[PDB]
Amino acid sequence: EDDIAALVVDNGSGMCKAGFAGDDAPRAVFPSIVGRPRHQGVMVGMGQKDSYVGDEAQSKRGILTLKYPIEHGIVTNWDDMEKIWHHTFYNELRVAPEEHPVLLTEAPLNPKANREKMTQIMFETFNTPAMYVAIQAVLSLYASGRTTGIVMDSGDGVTHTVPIYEGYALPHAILRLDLAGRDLTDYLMKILTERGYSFTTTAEREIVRDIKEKLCYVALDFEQEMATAASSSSLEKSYELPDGQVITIGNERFRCPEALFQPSFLGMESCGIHETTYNSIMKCDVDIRKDLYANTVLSGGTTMYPGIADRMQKEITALAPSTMKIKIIAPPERKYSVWIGGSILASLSTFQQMWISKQEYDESGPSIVHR
Amino acid sequence: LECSWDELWNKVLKAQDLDHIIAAHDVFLDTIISRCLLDSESRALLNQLRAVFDQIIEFQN
Amino acid sequence: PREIITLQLGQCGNQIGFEFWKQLCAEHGISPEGIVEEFATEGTDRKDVFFYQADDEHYIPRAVLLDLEPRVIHSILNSPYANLYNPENIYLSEHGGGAGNNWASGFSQGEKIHEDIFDIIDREADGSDSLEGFVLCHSIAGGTGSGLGSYLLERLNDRYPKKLVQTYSVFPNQDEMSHVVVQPYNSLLTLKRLTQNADCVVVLDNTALNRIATDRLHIQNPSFSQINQLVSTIMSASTTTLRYPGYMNNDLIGLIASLIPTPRLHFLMTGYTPLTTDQSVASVRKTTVLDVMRRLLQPKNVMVSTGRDRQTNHCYIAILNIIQGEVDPTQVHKSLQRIRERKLANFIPWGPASIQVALSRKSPYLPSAHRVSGLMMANHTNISSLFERTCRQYDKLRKREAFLEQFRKEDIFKDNFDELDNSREIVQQLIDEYHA
Amino acid sequence: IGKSINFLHQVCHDQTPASKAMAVGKSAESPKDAAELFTDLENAFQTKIDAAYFDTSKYLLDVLNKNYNLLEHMQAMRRYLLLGQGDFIRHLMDLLKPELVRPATTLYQHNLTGILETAVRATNAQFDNPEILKRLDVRLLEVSPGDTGWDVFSLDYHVDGPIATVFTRECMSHYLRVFNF
């Protein structure tokens, strides 16, 4: 059919999340890496292979050098980008995309010269029968059961603030802000160094990116949360990693979500998350502004916190007018909210003539994406 | 040693079965033993490859 | 362990071992203060063959540098390199006071820096487990490299008797005699110690350097700075069985045993095809093994000059042909076939003769990975042509009265000159006699 | 195809090769044959057994490639008893000459393993993480201990698990003969 036999590949900004449609989480997600040997010899670890990719490159990362084919959300090199597509279809799924349509993703700010490029790869090399290039912004909105609103994509890529009005986005309100989650995990190592615990192993730094979502919590009003630290509150948790190095949280717990609103800890004069939210809506048409306040959606892997839903709610009124109903739609999962929207789209009734095939590709070439 | 190293190792990466791994190995491991020492027709060889084995001990001591 | 302590000595001999160490570091793909790619350990499966073991992630070469000229050891500290060199153990700060151009200078400096010269090889063999031997990397150029090399062949031969001795001797140019003027004298003194107080030598000529230097190097001038390039490559090729995986004669005393008929007949001709690399975009057709080992027995690479009239009444007996790396190495026995149909070299019917083939994997580093290299180590009995020529240069200078009293101020006071001449003629008759 | 599913039961899994799209297939087929006139398929039946065949054969080599390093052990026994690399075995054979020259003992085995582990820490250090080095031991025969010591010594590559599937009993006995020459 294609009801369960349409493949959902959500090429995110640092992890490819592949799976079959009609599920609520991806089958296999892992960070997208490739690794190129410099001199080939006798191997070590996993058996003879031309390249260690993906999850056989994440098992050995000190015998190889890591290179993301998707860097800052966008494909930098297209040769190695086919190599991770090759990895997702045949190792971390196993089906041939020639009988099964493919639903692949895009950035809300990739150039069109790039967009004809990803259409040239799937049709020729993987020889897909049909596919459709879909925005990540609209899919996360679709998992939240709306068709209009603005999604606050904060992923392992570029922060997007995309107001979509009836599946059509405003091409004069998509701000590219340079805050990424990978910027925060990196900020967190260098203020751990003020406590006296410094990294020197790449494996200890991988758990910094886990701890950021795991141990670290968000309370309302950080400013009094450091004030309650001065009267010695309970909030300081000390993770033990077997070895002498410690990753503790407590005086760096609240600074690291505070860096969402304040990029000055990172050392820049750029816009904050609420600020880049407010600048995007403040250049939108005055008649459909109301529909964007009431359909604010959090999405991405940066806003993975238990208590960031209400922090953004008590915080966003103090910018925008109060004669606006602003309601923060915060799902507990949201990394997979792009993927759950991409699977649900495969099971959409009104999508069985919005497929981009090889025959329409044969009549107009790779500008059939113009659509 | 050469003709046989380039027989096993290059064939196994062509192979897709596991039963083809033993098909490229079971033809390897019975030639290696005939061309080295023992078969049952190589007995004119290994009377001379063992007669030289003891001749270098006695030439040495 | 087969640890060798290289004994760099003389004005040309320290500089050719200087780029010998520099060649090894670039080809193992490791920093010379450090390590950066672990593709260096996956690729070279033994990097301590000629280095001290690791425990700081450094590799300290197994070298000693004494030379009577302080210029060569000053040619390290005015070079940028000095982290692959130790200023207490790999070099001392200035040896000798000698000018030098006297063989009796370096012989008395050897009998009074005698304590420090045997305290620099046991400061370079305090990590040795089992010593293979000593390679005396000396020059015959000057009285610097030639005077002191004659002392150390006696005392390493009665203090360490089951150890390898092997020298990579060079001779200075015989077409200019301003370069060293004690040259016919010092060559014949050092030859007495090589033919009964040594085992194997590898003889190398400068008039045979310039035969090749106008052939593909396109320098007419007799280099003293691009003379260290040609030498460090053919040195590192001889032990590619002992640094990269061998199989049979995986030690260097495996190769060297197999190239000696009997002593005072061991002077081996070296030939090495790729001195410069034009296989850089014409390496993609895949340079075949088949028609490139045909010159590893033809004189179109040889480092020792001889006439061409002695390549038919004198015969090679042992020739080593080292091919390296993928090249389709299962058609390599097919290459050794096409030699005999040509008779690129004539071989004695009188007892055994041998055309020896080996292979070892190539360097992890790109200019030394698809660049087919052929290492020739011949032993041809027309090697006496240099030696009769040097003897002819010896008898004429002793009748012109230079170094018959100007070399008798120290260590000779009795005539013992016709003693060196008569023994020199015993060795040359014992060579020609072997081939029938 | 029925033999191959049993070889991943020597890896032990309850997984139908790779994807779960092979599992949907069993459910689809039972109604599709049932609904038909009374007719069984059989020109199409041989078509999806190709798509099953390429799936379970590349995957049965990929389940090993993650875990056991099969073909890596194919190169491994060859350098330790088919004498593939001489720098590994000369440096063995050097350190082994003061014990093989003397009469074998009842305590012969306890020193020959120990010099064996320090042998692969005097030419090797990048194969500790590999199990090559945890899969070699000392082989001794029936030969009476009056012997010289040489002849009875041989190294053997120790095989276990689903890797002993391809390292059958008939093979290495013949390598024993070829090691000796």
Please indicate whether, in this complex, the C-beta atoms of C329 and B1 are within 8 angstroms of each other: no
**Residue C110 assigned ligand-binding role:** no
Give CA–CA dist A11/C312, Å, rounded. 74
- For A350, other C-beta atoms within 10 Å of its C-beta total 7
- For D48, other C-beta atoms within 10 Å of its C-beta total 13
Give CA–CA dist C350/A131, Å, rounded. 79
Taking contacts as CB-CB distances below 8 angstroms, the residues of chain B near C247 are 1
Give CA–CA dist A235/A217, Å, rounded. 9
Give CA–CA dist D69/D67, Å, rounded. 6
Please indicate whether, in this complex, the C-beta atoms of C247 and D94 are within 8 angstroms of each other: no
- For A75, other C-beta atoms within 10 Å of its C-beta total 20
Nearest to D126 among C42, C241, C246 (CB): C42
Q: Give the resolution in Å.
A: 4.6
Instruction: Give the 3-state secondary structure of residue B59.
Output: helix
Taking contacts as CB-CB distances below 8 angstroms, the residues of chain A near C47 are none
Task: Report how many Cβ contacts below 8 Å link chain B to chain C.
Answer: 8
DSSP A325: -
User: Which residues are bridge partners to A106 per DSSP?
Assistant: A135
Interface check for D23 against chain A (CB to CB < 8 A): the answer is no
Q: Please say whether the beta carbons of D145 and D104 come within 8 A.
A: yes
Q: Token pair of C235, please?
A: 């040195």
Taking contacts as CB-CB distances below 8 angstroms, the residues of chain A near C365 are 39
Please indicate whether, in this complex, the C-beta atoms of D126 and A44 are within 8 angstroms of each other: yes
Rg, chain C, Cα only: 21
Residue A196 makes CB contacts below 8 A (sequence gap 6+) with none
As a whole number of angstroms, the longest Cα–Cα distance in chain C is 66
Interface check for B16 against chain D (CB to CB < 8 A): the answer is yes
Interface check for C1 against chain D (CB to CB < 8 A): the answer is yes
Nearest to B18 among D7, D175, D180 (CB): D7
Q: Please say whether the beta carbons of A169 and A137 come within 8 A.
A: yes
Q: Token pair of D46, please?
A: 């041989």
Nearest to B21 among D58, D166, D178 (CB): D166
Q: Please say whether the beta carbons of D64 and D70 come within 8 A.
A: yes
Chain D from 21 to 40: CB within 8 A of any C CB: none
Nearest to D178 among B8, B13, B32 (CB): B32
Residue of C nearest to A61 (CA): C38
**Residue C147 assigned ligand-binding role:** yes
Which residue, among C248, C323, C326, C330, would best test binding to B if mutated, counting the most B CBs under 10 Å from its CB?
A: C330
Give CA–CA dist C108/C10, Å, rounded. 15
User: Which residues are bridge partners to A131 per DSSP?
Assistant: A102, A356
Q: Token pair of A168, please?
A: 């059509």
Q: Token pair of C346, please?
A: 């004539």
Token pair 């200023």 in the structure block, residue: C87
**Residue C43 assigned ligand-binding role:** no
Give CA–CA dist C360/C362, Å, rounded. 7
User: Nearest 5°: CA angle at C328, between C326 and C332?
Assistant: 105
Give CA–CA dist C75/C44, Å, rounded. 29
Task: Report how many Cβ contacts below 8 Å link chain C to chain D.
Answer: 35
CA atoms within 13 A on the CB side of C369: 15
Please indicate whether, in this complex, the C-beta atoms of C330 and B2 are within 8 angstroms of each other: yes
Chain D from 56 to 115: CB within 8 A of any A CB: 59, 62, 64-66, 69-72, 75
Instruction: Give the 3-state secondary structure of residue A44.
Output: coil
- For A113, other C-beta atoms within 10 Å of its C-beta total 7
Tell me the technique behind this structure.
cryo-EM
Q: Please say whether the beta carbons of A258 and A222 come within 8 A.
A: yes
Q: Token pair of A341, please?
A: 């929207």
Q: Token pair of C119, please?
A: 């305290």
Token pair 């001797």 in the structure block, residue: C169
Residue of A nearest to C362 (CA): A41
DSSP C210: H
Give CA–CA dist D101/D97, Å, rounded. 6
Residue of C nearest to D95 (CA): C1
**Residue C98 assigned ligand-binding role:** no
User: Which residues are bridge partners to D166 per DSSP?
Assistant: none
Give CA–CA dist D60/D9, Å, rounded. 11
Q: How far is B44 from chain D (nearest CA, A)?
A: 15
Q: How far is B22 from chain C (nearest CA, A)?
A: 23
Chains in contact with C, where contact means 3 or more Cβ–Cβ distances below 8 Å, are A, B, D
Which residue, among D15, D27, D48, D65, would best test binding to A if mutated, counting the most A CBs under 10 Å from its CB?
A: D65
Torsion, Cα of D108, D114, D116, D121 (10° steps) = -160
Q: How far is CA B61 from CA B51, C66, D101, in A?
A: 16, 42, 14
Interface check for C45 against chain D (CB to CB < 8 A): the answer is yes
Give CA–CA dist C369/C279, Å, rounded. 11
Closest listed residue to residue A150, CA positions, set A287, A294, A283 = A294
Residue of D nearest to C39 (CA): D126
Q: How far is A47 from chain D (nearest CA, A)?
A: 5
Give CA–CA dist A360/A216, Å, rounded. 50
Q: How far is CA C279 from CA A75, C273, C276, D116, in A?
A: 36, 12, 9, 43
Please indicate whether, in this complex, the C-beta atoms of D74 and B12 are within 8 angstroms of each other: yes
With residue A210 as reference, give the H or E element that holds it: helix A202-214
DSSP A93: T
Length of chain B: 61
Task: Report how many Cβ contacts below 8 Å link chain A to chain D.
Answer: 39
Torsion, Cα of A355, A359, A361, A364 (10° steps) = -120
Q: Please say whether the beta carbons of B17 and D3 come within 8 A.
A: no
Q: Please say whether the beta carbons of C140 and C169 come within 8 A.
A: yes
Please indicate whether, in this complex, the C-beta atoms of D70 and A56 are within 8 angstroms of each other: no
Instruction: Give the 3-state secondary structure of residue C208.
Output: coil
Give CA–CA dist C150/C202, Å, rounded. 16
The D-side interface with B (CB below 8 A) comprises 3-4, 7, 54, 57-58, 60-61, 70-71, 74-75, 78, 82-84, 165-166, 168, 171, 174-175, 177-178, 180-181
Which residue, among D87, D88, D92, D132, would best test binding to C if mutated, counting the most C CBs under 10 Å from its CB?
A: D87
Q: How far is D84 from chain C (nearest CA, A)?
A: 7
Interface check for D131 against chain A (CB to CB < 8 A): the answer is no
Q: Please say whether the beta carbons of C29 and C37 come within 8 A.
A: yes
Residue of C nearest to B4 (CA): C330
Closest listed residue to residue C103, CA positions, set C162, C144, C45 = C144
Give CA–CA dist C60/C42, Å, rounded. 20
Length of chain A: 371
Length of chain C: 436
Please indicate whether, in this complex, the C-beta atoms of D85 and C38 are within 8 angstroms of each other: no
Q: Token pair of C89, please?
A: 């153990």
Please indicate whether, in this complex, the C-beta atoms of C29 and A63 are within 8 angstroms of each other: no
Give CA–CA dist A129/A359, Å, rounded. 9
Give CA–CA dist B43/D106, Å, rounded. 36
